[PDB]
Amino acid sequence: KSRLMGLEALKSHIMAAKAVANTMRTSLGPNGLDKMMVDKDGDVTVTNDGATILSMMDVDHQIAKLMVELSKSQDDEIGDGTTGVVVLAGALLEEAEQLLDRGIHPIRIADGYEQAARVAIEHLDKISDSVLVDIKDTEPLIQTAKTTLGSKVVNSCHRQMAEIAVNAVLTVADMERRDVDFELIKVEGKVGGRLEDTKLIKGVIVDKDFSHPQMPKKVEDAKIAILTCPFEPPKPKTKHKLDVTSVEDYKALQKYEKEKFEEMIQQIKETGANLAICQWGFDDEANHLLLQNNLPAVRWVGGPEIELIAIATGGRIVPRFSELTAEKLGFAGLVQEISFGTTKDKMLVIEQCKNSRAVTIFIRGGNKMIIEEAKRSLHDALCVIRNLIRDNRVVYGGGAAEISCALAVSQEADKCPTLEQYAMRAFADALEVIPMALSENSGMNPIQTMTEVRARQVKEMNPALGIDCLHKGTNDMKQQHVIETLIGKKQQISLATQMVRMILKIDDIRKPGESEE
């Protein structure tokens, strides 16, 4: 029931973003040294951006709290530029107390920052290309997945995922008319294969159930049968007592097994898709006695999976085996039995060109770490294109816009004047923090390094070139091909002042005795 005063609290608030944005500042880009996590439960791990770490790291403070909060929408849509606003909004945060230290309203500072984003927005608007197209955006997503597959799990872009990144997002994008949903595209690793086992999956992938391979392994039709019902006498993935009270009932069971096999072989086939996903578990014995009959029989299925693949198909499920229709079967654009890894079982890949209301692209790994290190690449590389198809707009990033968007805004300052010029000035500077901070995390002297494209900014304007993000001896964003969705940068722009705008919200810094409690 003790109460900080305004600036005090903000001075207490400003104590937050510093270190947590700092963590980014040597983590920014590949020249940034990425983030590590350890656990009270004893797990040491590597973390990335803001979200990964700042969610894995736990946030004491409303500032720190809003971080993950402010963070989400970023990595959700664009996926790239997440770690950025942390530094940025943290920089502007340290610009805010500063102007309060310069005796300027918390009110006013957050005011002229907002449209200061605009003079950066309009500035960003100009930068690079506000265009991309299918054969075009292939190549920047190549580049995007160059820097995506070359900055994270492996430093070697592996063009598979680099192309796997482009195609299935398009697949949901071209389905959704230059719209796409990160929910629908999905990045699925399963280890035992390789990070060089990488799969473009526009449908569902599940291990094809074999209670016997030799009893023929096959994939049939192109289409899937999604069943809450049995394709062979059913069972809910729970123990079912197999005993027979006499020596004679021993004889009739396996017949009953096969009588319903062939009957469910009959009645699901006449329904359609001899491959049939039976939500129900079942004995490895009789499951392969149907396999012995025919038609590898999918059993012990996840309750979600059937409805998961159902909704993805847009088709329903057979709830009851007496109820039979192909709409209650699923829709596979292609059912394909696919060996999962060299190490283990064939799967059944259902690739849905019928309807994919979910697209889960696939990869394997030599390790669960690297495979998730890879998905870490994949998600956000699928996230840029996600928006980046909704707008094909891209801006050479990496400090070239930061050194630049600051140009408009800090020059807009004395265009503005009164309080706005400050809120143009202490605004735009936060931009050039990152090329500084990227030169920081590099082996580079940032002010020096910043001074360079500065001269360029006087020499040239809005460099498609820039400073090395890769720490290349040459400095472009062109030679570096460092260019981000001209959404995402501005999408990123949208975030930073908002936080400062958030920390001010009401006049109440008081606490009942409850603040973070």
Partner 1 sequence: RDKPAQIRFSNISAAKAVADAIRTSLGPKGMDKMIQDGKGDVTITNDGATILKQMQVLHPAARMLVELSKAQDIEAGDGTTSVVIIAGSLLDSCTKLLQKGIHPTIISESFQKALEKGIEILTDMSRPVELSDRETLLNSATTSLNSKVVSQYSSLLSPMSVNAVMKVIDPATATSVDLRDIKIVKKLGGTIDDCELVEGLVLTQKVSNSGITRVEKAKIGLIQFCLSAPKTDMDNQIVVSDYAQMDRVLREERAYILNLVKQIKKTGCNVLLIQKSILRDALSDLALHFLNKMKIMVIKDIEREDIEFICKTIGTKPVAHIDQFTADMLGSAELAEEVNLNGSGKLLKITGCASPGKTVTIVVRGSNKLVIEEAERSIHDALCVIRCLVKKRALIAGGGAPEIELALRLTEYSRTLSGMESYCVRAFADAMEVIPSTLAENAGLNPISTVTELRNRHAQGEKTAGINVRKGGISNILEELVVQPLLVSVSALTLATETVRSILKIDDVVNTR
Measured from the CB atom, the residue of 358 and 424 that comes closer to partner 1 is 424
Least distance in Å: CB of 100 to partner 1?
A: 11
Site string for partner 1, 59-98 (x = CB under 8 A): ----------------------------------------
Q: Is 398 annotated as a binding residue?
A: yes
Distance CA 9, CA 475 (A): 42
Of 472, 388, 369, nearest to 152 by C-alpha is 369
419 sits near partner 1 (criterion: CB under 8 A): yes
How far apart, in whole angstroms, are the C-alpha atoms of residue 458 and residue 446? Answer: 18
Say whether 17 sits in a helix, a strand or coil.
helix
Sequence-separated (6 or more) residues with CB below 8 Å from residue 41: none
Residue 454 C-beta: closest distance to partner 1, Å: 3
Residue 460 CB, shortest distance to partner 1, in Å, is 11
DSSP letter at 249 equals H
Torsion 74-372-199-361 (CA) sign: negative
Q: Is 410 in the site for partner 1 (CB under 8 A)?
A: yes
Closer CB to partner 1, 157 or 423, in the complex: 423
User: Is there binding between residue 19 and partner 1 (CB under 8 A)?
Assistant: no
Q: What does the per-residue mask of binding to partner 1 show for 423-452, with x meaning CB under 8 A?
A: --x---------------------xx--x-
Window of 306-314, 336-344, 421-429, 498-506 that interacts with partner 1 by CB under 8 A:
421-429
One symbol per residue from 450 to 489: x for binding partner 1 (CB under 8 A), - otherwise; what is it? -x--xx-xx-------------------------------
Q: Give the amino acid at 283.
A: D
Exactly one of 6, 252, 417, 460 binds partner 1 (CB under 8 A); that residue is 417
Give the integer Cα–Cα distance in Å for 204 and 141: 24
Our measurement of the distance from residue 41's CA atom to the centroid of its chain's CA atoms, rounded to an integer in Å, reads 26
Cα gap 398→240, rounded to integer Å = 61
Calculate Rg over the CA atoms of the chain. 28
Asked whether residue 410 is marked as a ligand-binding residue, the answer is no
Nearest residue (CB) to partner 1, 88 versus 187: 88
> Which amino acid, residue 159?
R
Closest CA to 428 of 388, 457, 396: 457
CB of residue 350 to partner 1, shortest distance in Å: 58
Q: What angle do CA 133, 136, 140 make, to 5 degrees?
A: 110
39 is in an annotated binding site: no
Binding residues for ATP: 29, 82-83, 398
- Residues in contact with partner 1 by CB under 8 A are 103-104, 410-411, 414, 417-419, 421-422, 425, 447-448, 451, 454-455, 457-458
Binding residues for Mg(2+): 80
